């Protein structure tokens, strides 16, 4: 067995010193030979033997051994007699090994029969020289093999920047950007580093964007009906820039009435863009509603006040107006689902108005959690923390049904708690959750959740997927690709820090794999219209008989916010032709929000085709 | 591993 990778591992103990030196449990995982876990010895009385050190791996690995690295500075607390326990579920534990280690500074190794475990506990019974009631350790490694499947990961893909915002383009290309710099941010320099990854060839084009005077770090994003991507606020808090995928260039838009950052933008049923909140930039507070049209620019909605969306963040309005969970709803309305406990109905006519939707059951505030629309008027919320900064994340998930009402229920908890994660609606109706960490501290990788999970509406259960290789915490992104795979990238963007990830990885979901790990034969779309109108009947030819399709709106994503994606399942009617079917698009543009969609054919095993692009008006 | 020193 080689050592397992320790990304995301969290160490805790019976007792630990912090008064007389830094003896925290967490020091066994940092890789530094000079930093120790030491049992608590001050004040008197010192804590007595035995002492325990527990490791939560975040995942159910196969464990076949443990490596103990003693301190190098002196002999105090070198473990003598030892016990090793394992749990998969947290509650029942099993002995795998028991022994004694000699009184020297040599790294010790213990190997046993392979065991399925998320947790490994080391009990120290004696101090190898009986010098005192002490245990200590510089490093703990674990030997064995990580889970393979379900699903599979690509190798990492090199990026020339930290991809901290991202959008899917037609033609199987992915636009990403960072800030004025590939690896840091700040000021209002009016330049953004960008990179387009070609999903076919793996090639990356890098482009500095200076023509619109906009550093587009920390903005609101959405997809427009005509195909363009509107990006407003951020480091240049008043700017609007629009990206055209025909030209692959940016064009200046008009300024917002008030600058903002970390706000939420959402394309409405009319193809206008509504925005609310965002005190990260442009000033503190009063970040009330605005709406953009292409003919009139940004107009104020003074009767859409921010007060309704504010969480009880300890950081106040700087954080409490961040990253609202905004959705286009039937009828042309906007729905606010969170992260605040309080949910709202927003109307954009006139000066606007807000109506309370009541709370999200008994959820606490869920800042940096995800909300994902997996069907018509059906949303799944999950993860988040009551606070933006230094705050315990939750594993709780709540469903919300907004069809002719508001109906909230609590669903299954995730196997791990997450903040800073991303959510991705998949074509089969399931929802993937990716990344995040256990305790929200922006710019850290500590307690990163390495194994995505998949929620099946049919049973409301979460299933763990094969884990990825790079932690994806703050400033990470994930989104659906047209071949049905999921891109994950980014993390960090903190300058001389050691947590920048200038890469991504691509997840192949279980729906594309045979039991043996060979690629599943997929349905194929042979012919389909490239444009269509809400309420239209359209004709689709597949290469075999298909009766279920998914319209999946294309995504933009940053800082956990994705107002664009949504699943609209359609039932095919058979016609006279050879595996040619009719689909009927919903007439309601509140539901069928205009923009770029990926149309997917779903086979009887629920395997999806590669999608085709259809621009819906 | 690495070391920061004592
Ligand atoms: O008294 C207990 C302490 O003794 C010190 O000499 C030692 O450097 C500490 O790591 C701890 O063992
Ligand atoms: Ca250490």
């Amino acid at each position: 067995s080689g050592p397992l990778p320790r990304d995301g591992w969290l160490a805790s103990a019976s007792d630990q010193e912090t008064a007389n030196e830094n003896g925290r449990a967490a020091n066994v995982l940092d890789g530094d030979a000079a930093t120790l876990w030491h049992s608590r010895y001050s004040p008197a009385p010192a804590a007595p033997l035995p002492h325990t050190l527990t490791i939560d791996m975040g995942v159910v690995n196969q464990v076949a051994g443990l490596r103990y690295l003693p301190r190098f500075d002196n002999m105090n607390g070198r473990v003598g007699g030892y016990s090793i326990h394992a749990s998969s579920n947290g509650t029942s534990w099993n002995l795998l090994a028991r022994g004694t280690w000699a009184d020297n500074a040599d790294e010790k190794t213990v190997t046993f029969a392979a065991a399925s475990a998320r947790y490994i506990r080391l009990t120290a019974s004696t101090e190898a020289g009986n010098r005192g009631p002490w245990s200590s350790a510089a490093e703990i490694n674990l030997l064995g093999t990580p889970p393979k499947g379900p699903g599979t990961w690509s190798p990492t893909v090199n990026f020339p920047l930290v991809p901290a915002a991202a959008a899917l383009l037609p033609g199987n290309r992915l636009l990403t950007w960072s800030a004025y710099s590939p690896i840091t941010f700040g000021g209002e320099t009016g330049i953004t580093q960008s990179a387009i990854l070609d999903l076919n060839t793996g090639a990356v084009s890098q482009a500095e964007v200076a023509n619109t005077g906009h550093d587009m770090f920390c903005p609101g994003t959405s997809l427009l009906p005509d195909g363009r991507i509107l990006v407003s606020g951020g480091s240049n808090s008043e700017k609007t820039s629009l990206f055209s995928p025909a030209t692959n260039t940016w064009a200046p838009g008009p300024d917002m009435n008030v600058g903002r950052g970390y706000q939420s933008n959402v394309t409405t049923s009319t193809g206008e863009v509504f925005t609310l909140g965002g005190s990260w930039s442009g000033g503190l507070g009063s970040k009330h509603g605005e709406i953009w049209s292409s003919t009139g620019g940004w107009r104020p909605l003074p009767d859409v006040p921010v007060d309704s969306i504010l969480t009880d963040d300890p950081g106040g309005e700087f954080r409490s107006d961040n990253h609202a969970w905004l959705f286009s709803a039937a009828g042309g309305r906007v729905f606010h689902a969170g992260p605040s406990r309080e949910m709202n109905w927003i109307s954009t006519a006139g000066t606007g108005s807000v109506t309370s939707a009541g709370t999200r059951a008994d959820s606490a505030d869920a800042m940096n959690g995800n909300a994902v629309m997996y069907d018509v008027g059906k949303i799944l919320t999950m993860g988040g923390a009551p606070g933006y900064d230094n705050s315990d994340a939750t594993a709780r998930a709540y469903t919300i049904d907004i069809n002719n009402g508001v109906d909230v229920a609590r669903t299954s908890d995730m196997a791990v708690s997450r903040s800073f994660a991303n959510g991705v609606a998949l074509p089969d109706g399931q929802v993937l959750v990716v990344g995040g960490q256990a305790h929200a501290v922006p710019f850290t990788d500590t307690g990163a959740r390495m194994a995505p999970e998949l929620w099946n509406p049919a049973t409301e259960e979460w299933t763990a997927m094969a884990p990825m290789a790079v932690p994806r915490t703050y400033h990470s992104v994930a989104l659906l690709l047209a071949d049905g795979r999921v891109f994950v990238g980014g993390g960090g963007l903190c300058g001389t820090c050691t947590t920048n990830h200038l890469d991504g990885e691509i997840f192949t979901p279980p729906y594309l794999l045979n039991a043996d790990g060979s690629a599943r034969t997929r349905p194929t779309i042979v012919d389909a219209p490239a444009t269509a109108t809400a309420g239209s009947k359209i004709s689709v030819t597949t290469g075999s008989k298909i009766s279920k399709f998914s319209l999946m709106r294309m995504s933009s994503v940053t800082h956990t916010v994705n107002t664009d994606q949504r699943r609209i399942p359609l039932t095919a009617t058979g016609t006279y032709g050879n595996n040619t079917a009719t689909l009927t698009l919903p007439a309601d543009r509140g539901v069928l929000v205009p923009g770029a969609y990926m149309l997917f054919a779903m086979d009887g095993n629920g395997v999806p085709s590669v999608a085709t692009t259809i621009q819906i008006s | 591993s690495h070391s920061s020193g004592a």
Side-chain angles (χ1 to χ4, degrees):
Chain A
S1 281
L4 283 155
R6 308 187 292 163
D7 304 85
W9 290 12
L10 288 168
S12 54
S14 53
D15 51 282
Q16 65 191 9
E17 182 69 19
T18 63
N20 182 226
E21 63 184 299
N22 185 345
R24 301 179 165 84
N27 295 345
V28 298
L29 300 184
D30 63 6
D32 183 346
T35 58
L36 315 180
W37 165 64
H38 198 303
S39 51
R40 194 187 63 73
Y41 61 80
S42 71
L49 286 154
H51 297 288
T52 70
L53 180 85
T54 300
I55 290 161
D56 182 359
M57 276 181 307
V59 301
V60 175
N61 290 315
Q62 301 286 103
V63 182
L66 175 156
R67 276 200 186 118
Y68 168 78
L69 176 76
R71 63 194 308 171
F72 66 68
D73 53 324
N74 65 61
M75 301 167 327
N76 286 356
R78 280 183 187 161
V79 173
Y82 69 79
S83 292
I84 295 182
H85 285 82
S87 179
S88 273
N89 56 8
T91 66
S92 49
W93 295 78
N94 289 291
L95 181 79
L96 310 179
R98 184 182 283 243
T100 308
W101 288 318
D103 193 17
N104 61 53
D106 286 348
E107 177 169 4
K108 310 296 196 296
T109 311
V110 180
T111 42
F112 36 83
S116 282
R118 179 186 162 162
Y119 315 78
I120 301 290
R121 183 211 304 155
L122 177 64
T123 308
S125 282
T126 69
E127 198 277 355
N130 285 333
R131 289 170 276 273
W134 307 311
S135 311
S136 63
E139 284 302 299
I140 302 287
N141 284 279
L142 295 168
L143 304 182
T145 45
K148 335 195 186 189
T152 194
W153 288 87
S154 79
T156 55
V157 164
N158 302 337
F159 276 75
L161 52 81
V162 183
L168 189 69
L169 310 182
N172 200 56
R173 296 163 310 130
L174 177 70
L175 166 69
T176 72
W177 67 94
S178 73
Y180 79 92
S181 176
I183 65 176
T184 198
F185 66 85
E188 46 204 45
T189 50
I191 289 167
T192 308
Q193 304 306 322
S194 82
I196 297 175
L197 170 68
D198 178 325
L199 284 178
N200 290 310
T201 65
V204 169
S205 334
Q206 200 281 312
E208 165 167 310
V209 183
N211 67 295
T212 72
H214 193 183
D215 178 337
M216 281 170 287
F217 176 63
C218 274
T221 69
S222 66
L223 265 64
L224 303 191
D226 54 64
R228 282 182 294 170
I229 300 164
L230 190 158
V231 181
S232 72
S235 291
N236 288 92
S237 57
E238 87 273 22
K239 314 299 270 150
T240 316
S241 300
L242 291 109
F243 179 91
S244 159
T247 67
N248 298 297
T249 48
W250 297 80
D255 290 6
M256 279 177 309
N257 296 273
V258 57
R260 44 190 94 215
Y262 286 17
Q263 82 276 20
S264 200
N265 290 12
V266 59
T267 300
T268 65
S269 70
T270 66
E272 291 171 295
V273 179
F274 175 72
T275 192
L276 182 61
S279 272
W280 180 82
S281 61
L284 273 195
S286 300
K287 300 322 177 71
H288 300 300
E290 291 191 57
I291 183 168
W292 171 94
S293 72
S294 73
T295 54
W298 291 104
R299 67 181 193 82
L301 292 173
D303 286 286
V304 180
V306 67
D307 298 69
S308 47
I309 70 153
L310 302 185
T311 72
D312 316 305
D313 195 280
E317 216 154 6
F318 178 66
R319 296 301 203 188
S320 67
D321 71 14
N322 297 3
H323 316 312
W325 303 351
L326 294 185
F327 288 100
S328 174
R333 280 182 287 258
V334 170
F335 182 74
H336 171 251
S340 73
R341 281 169 28 253
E342 179 61 355
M343 300 190 315
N344 296 96
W345 293 100
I346 299 154
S347 154
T348 70
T351 69
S353 73
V354 191
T355 315
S356 171
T359 69
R360 187 169 67 260
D362 63 324
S363 183
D365 296 332
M367 184 54 73
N368 304 299
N370 317 125
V372 174
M373 183 164 298
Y374 61 92
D375 199 347
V376 172
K378 293 191 198 311
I379 302 162
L380 176 80
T381 68
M382 65 281 209
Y388 203 117
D389 295 286
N390 304 301
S391 172
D392 283 347
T394 186
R396 297 210 182 188
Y398 294 83
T399 63
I400 310 179
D401 187 315
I402 58 167
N403 295 297
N404 217 14
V406 183
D407 165 73
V408 186
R410 196 181 155 187
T411 193
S412 303
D413 292 357
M414 283 175 316
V416 294
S417 66
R418 298 179 200 251
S419 176
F420 300 140
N422 285 278
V424 180
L426 296 192
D428 60 356
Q430 308 190 266
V431 172
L432 181 71
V433 67
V434 175
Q437 54 180 170
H439 184 77
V441 181
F443 303 117
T444 70
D445 279 357
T446 317
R449 308 309 201 178
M450 300 305 289
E453 288 171 65
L454 190 59
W455 183 80
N456 178 345
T459 59
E460 301 189 19
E461 311 196 285
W462 291 99
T463 304
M465 300 291 101
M468 61 204 189
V470 175
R472 303 298 179 193
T473 54
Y474 194 52
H475 284 165
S476 71
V477 303
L479 68 166
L480 180 70
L481 308 181
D483 71 354
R485 296 150 64 233
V486 178
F487 172 80
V488 185
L493 201 78
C494 41
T496 62
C497 74
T498 63
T499 68
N500 297 310
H501 310 284
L502 289 70
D503 50 54
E505 303 159 76
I506 292 168
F507 184 54
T508 297
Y511 56 20
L512 292 179
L513 290 188
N514 290 299
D516 63 13
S518 64
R520 180 107 58 161
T521 56
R522 308 180 68 166
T524 64
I525 296 159
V526 156
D527 188 338
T531 59
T533 280
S536 302
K537 270 202 189 159
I538 63 160
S539 187
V540 172
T541 295
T542 45
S544 71
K545 201 75 69 192
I546 291 287
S547 62
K548 285 148 200 178
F549 295 83
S550 285
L551 272 179
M552 304 294 298
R553 193 159 185 290
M554 290 189 182
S555 287
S556 65
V557 55
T558 191
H559 282 84
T560 79
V561 176
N562 172 6
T563 63
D564 290 300
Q565 81 182 318
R566 57 176 60 202
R567 170 161 173 277
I568 301 189
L570 296 166
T571 298
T573 304
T575 62
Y576 295 94
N578 186 55
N579 304 293
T580 80
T582 317
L583 307 175
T584 298
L585 307 186
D588 189 342
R589 277 168 174 102
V591 170
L592 187 64
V593 177
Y597 288 70
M598 294 167 286
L599 170 74
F600 281 99
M602 304 300 302
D603 93 4
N605 307 311
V607 182
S609 68
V610 174
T612 64
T613 294
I614 185 172
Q615 196 76 20
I616 295 176
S617 281
Chain B
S1 54
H2 60 286
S3 168
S4 58

